[PDB]
Amino acid sequence: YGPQTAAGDLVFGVCHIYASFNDTFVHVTDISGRETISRVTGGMKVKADRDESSPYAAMLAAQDVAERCKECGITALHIKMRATGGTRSKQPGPGAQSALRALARSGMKIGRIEDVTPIPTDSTRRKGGRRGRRL
Amino acid sequence: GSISRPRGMRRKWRKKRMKRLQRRRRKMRQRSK
Amino acid sequence: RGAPLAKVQFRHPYKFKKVTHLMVACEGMYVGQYIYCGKKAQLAIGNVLPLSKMPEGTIVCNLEAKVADRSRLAKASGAYAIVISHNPDTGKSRVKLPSGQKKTVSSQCRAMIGLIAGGGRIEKPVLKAGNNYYRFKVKRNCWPRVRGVAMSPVDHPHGGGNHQHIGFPCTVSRNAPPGQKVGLIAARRTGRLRGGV
Amino acid sequence: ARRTVKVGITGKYGTRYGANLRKRVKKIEISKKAKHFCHWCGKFRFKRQAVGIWHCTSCGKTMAGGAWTLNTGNSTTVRSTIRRLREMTE
Amino acid sequence: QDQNINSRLQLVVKSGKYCLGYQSTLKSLRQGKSKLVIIANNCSPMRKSEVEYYAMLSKTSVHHYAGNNIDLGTACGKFFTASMLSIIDAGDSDIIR
Amino acid sequence: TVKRRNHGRNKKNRGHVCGIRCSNCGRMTPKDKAVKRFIVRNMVETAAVRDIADASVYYTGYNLPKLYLKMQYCISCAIHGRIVRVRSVENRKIRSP
Amino acid sequence: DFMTRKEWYDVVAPTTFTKRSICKTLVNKSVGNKNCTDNLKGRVFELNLGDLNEDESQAHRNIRLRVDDVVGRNCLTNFHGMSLTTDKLRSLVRKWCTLVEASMDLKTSDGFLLRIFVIGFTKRRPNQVRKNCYAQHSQVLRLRKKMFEIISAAVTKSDLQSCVKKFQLETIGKDIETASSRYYPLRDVHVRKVKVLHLPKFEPNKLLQEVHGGELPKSWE
RNA sequence: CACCAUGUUCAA
RNA sequence: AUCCACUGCAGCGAAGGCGUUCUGCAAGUGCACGUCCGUCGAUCAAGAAUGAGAGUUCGGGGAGCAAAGAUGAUCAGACACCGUCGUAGUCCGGCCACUGUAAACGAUGCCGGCCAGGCCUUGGCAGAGCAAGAAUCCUAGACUCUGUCAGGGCCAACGAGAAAUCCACAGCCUGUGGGUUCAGGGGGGAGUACUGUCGCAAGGCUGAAACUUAAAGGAAUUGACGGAAUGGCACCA
Numbered sequence A: 001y002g003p004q005t006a007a008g009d010l011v012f013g014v015c016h017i018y019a020s021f022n023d024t025f026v027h028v029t030d031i032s033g034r035e036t037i038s039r040v041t042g043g044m045k046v047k048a049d050r051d052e053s054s055p056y057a058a059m060l061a062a063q064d065v066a067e068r069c070k071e072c073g074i075t076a077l078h079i080k081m082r083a084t085g086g087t088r089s090k091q092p093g094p095g096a097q098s099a100l101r102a103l104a105r106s107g108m109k110i111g112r113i114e115d116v117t118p119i120p121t122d123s124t125r126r127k128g129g130r131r132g133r134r135l
Numbered sequence B: 001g002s003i004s005r006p007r008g009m010r011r012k013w014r015k016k017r018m019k020r021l022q023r024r025r026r027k028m029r030q031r032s033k
Numbered sequence C: 001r002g003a004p005l006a007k008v009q010f011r012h013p014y015k016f017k018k019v020t021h022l023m024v025a026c027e028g029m030y031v032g033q034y035i036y037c038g039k040k041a042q043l044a045i046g047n048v049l050p051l052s053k054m055p056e057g058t059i060v061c062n063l064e065a066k067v068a069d070r071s072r073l074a075k076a077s078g079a080y081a082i083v084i085s086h087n088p089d090t091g092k093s094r095v096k097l098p099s100g101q102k103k104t105v106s107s108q109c110r111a112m113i114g115l116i117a118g119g120g121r122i123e124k125p126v127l128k129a130g131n132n133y134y135r136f137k138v139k140r141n142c143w144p145r146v147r148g149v150a151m152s153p154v155d156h157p158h159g160g161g162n163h164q165h166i167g168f169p170c171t172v173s174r175n176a177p178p179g180q181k182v183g184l185i186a187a188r189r190t191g192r193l194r195g196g197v
Numbered sequence D: 001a002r003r004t005v006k007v008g009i010t011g012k013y014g015t016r017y018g019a020n021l022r023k024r025v026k027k028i029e030i031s032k033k034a035k036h037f038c039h040w041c042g043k044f045r046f047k048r049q050a051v052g053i054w055h056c057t058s059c060g061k062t063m064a065g066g067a068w069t070l071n072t073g074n075s076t077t078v079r080s081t082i083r084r085l086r087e088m089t090e
Numbered sequence E: 001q002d003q004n005i006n007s008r009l010q011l012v013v014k015s016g017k018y019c020l021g022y023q024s025t026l027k028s029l030r031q032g033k034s035k036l037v038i039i040a041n042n043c044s045p046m047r048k049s050e051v052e053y054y055a056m057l058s059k060t061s062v063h064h065y066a067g068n069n070i071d072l073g074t075a076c077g078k079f080f081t082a083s084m085l086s087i088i089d090a091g092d093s094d095i096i097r
Numbered sequence F: 001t002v003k004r005r006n007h008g009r010n011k012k013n014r015g016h017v018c019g020i021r022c023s024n025c026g027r028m029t030p031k032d033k034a035v036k037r038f039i040v041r042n043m044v045e046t047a048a049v050r051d052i053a054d055a056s057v058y059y060t061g062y063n064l065p066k067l068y069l070k071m072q073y074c075i076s077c078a079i080h081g082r083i084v085r086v087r088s089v090e091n092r093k094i095r096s097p
Numbered sequence G: 001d002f003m004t005r006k007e008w009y010d011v012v013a014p015t016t017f018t019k020r021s022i023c024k025t026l027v028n029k030s031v032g033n034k035n036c037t038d039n040l041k042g043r044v045f046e047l048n049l050g051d052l053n054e055d056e057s058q059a060h061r062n063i064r065l066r067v068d069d070v071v072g073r074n075c076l077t078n079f080h081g082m083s084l085t086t087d088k089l090r091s092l093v094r095k096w097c098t099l100v101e102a103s104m105d106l107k108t109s110d111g112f113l114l115r116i117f118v119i120g121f122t123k124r125r126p127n128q129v130r131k132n133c134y135a136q137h138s139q140v141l142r143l144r145k146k147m148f149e150i151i152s153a154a155v156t157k158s159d160l161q162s163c164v165k166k167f168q169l170e171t172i173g174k175d176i177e178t179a180s181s182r183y184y185p186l187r188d189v190h191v192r193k194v195k196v197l198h199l200p201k202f203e204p205n206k207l208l209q210e211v212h213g214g215e216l217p218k219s220w221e
Numbered sequence H: 001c002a003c004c005a006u007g008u009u010c011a012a
Numbered sequence I: 001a002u003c004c005a006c007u008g009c010a011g012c013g014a015a016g017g018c019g020u021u022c023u024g025c026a027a028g029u030g031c032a033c034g035u036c037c038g039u040c041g042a043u044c045a046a047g048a049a050u051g052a053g054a055g056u057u058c059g060g061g062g063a064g065c066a067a068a069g070a071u072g073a074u075c076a077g078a079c080a081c082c083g084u085c086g087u088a089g090u091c092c093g094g095c096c097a098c099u100g101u102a103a104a105c106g107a108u109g110c111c112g113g114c115c116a117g118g119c120c121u122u123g124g125c126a127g128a129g130c131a132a133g134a135a136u137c138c139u140a141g142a143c144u145c146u147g148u149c150a151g152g153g154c155c156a157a158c159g160a161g162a163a164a165u166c167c168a169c170a171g172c173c174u175g176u177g178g179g180u181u182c183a184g185g186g187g188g189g190a191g192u193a194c195u196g197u198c199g200c201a202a203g204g205c206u207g208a209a210a211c212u213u214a215a216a217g218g219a220a221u222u223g224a225c226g227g228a229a230u231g232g233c234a235c236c237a
Ligand SMILES: [Zn+2]
Pocket: D038, D039, D040, D041, D042, D043, D045, D056, D057, D058, D059, D060, D061
């Protein structure tokens, strides 16, 4: 099933792409965000714990979410990319460009593109003491 | 590195050992008096 | 009582008279003060006005729990409640009680603006047994208090034994009959409180 | 001459009840016994009659506040918050 | 709001005539001696109103000091208090000007 | 053996400088001692710019949004992630990129 | 499997914006006692001005519209907030300048309470040789008082519809950067964010025919 | 950025 | 709880330290000046007031982080680094709570005089300019130039230094003396013991000796090494 509109129109959902260093969410929802349509993570497409953030897992996840959002009736995506943000890291993880390419090549039209990494006007004490994650 | 050759262990840690010694001594003399 | 009281004299509603009511005193209230009671009263210390004319930061005492009730909340020394929020949909109001709880009471309940007087009295350590003697001698027959481990098993579920001890868990149930409901009544937890409560 | 070093009004308790408790009761009893400032007449005359009751021997005023001191700190901040709330919802 | 009242008061007490006190002020108001009546902010409301009424009868000016009786005395150079102050002879003070 | 005339930091006329947190390590480093780089990237690199612009509606080359990061590093992580490299005693006095 | 129990609703924007038929939103259908109208009542959508007005010159502005009433498959969205884009204002902020920020809570005479946060940056004169173009603190206090009274004179004594229309036609920013040259020249003066804090009673017919004019587009179904 | 501890005495 | 970006060879404060906006309160420096006083000043044992963080005390608060603890890995071990929790603590208030230490550093006492050049920057004052929104008017706290006073730095002679380096000083020093305070006398033992004094305590300040030893130490050089970087290379890789 799907929505009904005139011939020359595009149904726009919003695709939140959560690209942290440990996983990768691809999350297609209604423009409100209130109604999830389909979300797939990089950990649903691989066996190893490592590959949850691999560029291949994010590709397969954004694929398998694009096919289902087409099944539902969504044709274009306003894209909202996100890193862990807050205090962790404002740099988007590896499986972000691969999710973008997956959606674009798969066939979803791409509207706006955005960065919604949570950032602080000022922040709570970051994890790891004064000396940080000594390695 | 940041420092030149402590001729023993870390001065902070031997300072700390001295403090522990000193209050053990203090307790032994508080036993008597 | 720990808080001072106030004889406050109003006029009679329908008689030529003067009704002298008695209410727990507000901190700062003095003799000859002209407190004001009603819906159109102003937000001044000591005034009694409905819980709806109060902005959402007001510090109140002598708070009612029901409409037409008369001051059943926040009445001990240094007690005060804080008006958190109002709801006009229901005509009700969330208030933060001295216990730290948040109670919802109708916005027609009347409070008194300010603190309850006589505050700071638990910040003095009673130094003698005689101080607490005189304390409770005017309240009720409850002091001193023999502890149950020091009794005999005929007098308390804790008594007896060759060493003074409780042989069973102190945390007793809530459905415990009256007579074995001694110890920690329906305790959700025990031990030292650390972190959050 | 000076009659005590640390003990103050707590000389009445002598040796009993513990130093750290006599400390607190000294801080409390100095204020309970002292004459406080009357913001009405401008004289340091408020004597504590009972717990929470303070009578001014000059002005004659009778005020309710404070077990051991005329004004608690929460009272002085409550006055300010109530004043500003009234100021804004004039 | 300017605060040179506390400065002109030094001039009044240096040279000029003042009446410190409720009764002195009322006597100056009953006669035609007073030119200004300063009133401490903490004064009793009833005495405040009484002095303001006497001043509106005498066509005299009243100034609310924004200080206590303690501060009014201190501004006068005094180690006592004063709720009222009557200024009979300004001298060189330049208050009402 | 003072290695730097400014002792690893740009603090001058200050007593205390706010301590910031390294981007990855999470180490508290003074705001002036930290090796800080405000970097601007794109949401998309040219390895994907054509493939996305061909499927976009409101974007194209020279039009995609950017990332503005401001990565702050401690000296350890800077040297490790080769944001900075050890320089000669004479090339340490070079302060312009 | 979950799409079987869902309908689509058209999201219709107010009179200010050119494009109205947008955002076919989803919801679970009705099972009798519980309907989906009160599930859509409050469904805030963030929508770019570049799509609400179809011009790319305004594509750096997200507008958050709140659903307030539904008619058939047409849910009526009113103004709830607006903001720049992170890309936009992070490109705006550069280093050696000085940013002046201002925040006001004002009333639009409709009862709407608005928070307005405006951002501006000091400007380099063309002949300038120094690198600073820093403003002084007294200069920034004066600029902020100017900002405050400009934003007031703009939004208050003007209904929320005209306020939104100005936010589109960003006259507040230009008025501020024009008046700034007397204290310190400002650049890129834009309203960073606008929020609706407290809104009055609903008045559904008012919502229907004053913030819209009717003309509800053809709700395809 | 898995983990990688040690090297008898004088003599050179 | 904290005030990102702006945020810096920037400012302020005696130092510790200080960063959202409006606002109350008192204050400081600098600058301008035919204002006043008229030596009232410099440095300071004793004394006094501030003094990061940790720590203690009494009452609250507890998001996040986190000693101890728990706990999963790693390991030969690993109550270590790494991971998940987690208590005190970090936050607020207090007779004006106590403590009174830091790589509290510029490892550089304070007051005064003189000290080549070039560059950047902060705040005034002075004199100029082609030098600024809406407009086109009009002025404008913006910008440019010059001078000067005060401040913050950078690089470049003489000099100094054991050198590193210093440079409005670490110069003016065997061609040694402007004034003043504090501290040091090879390395350890030892900032220990005893005693005194302050503190609730932790502890601060004060502070040896017996004995032991020929070097410790500082700067710089050449090589070697590096689980440091860069760049070449080898089928003994
Ligand atoms: Zn009195």
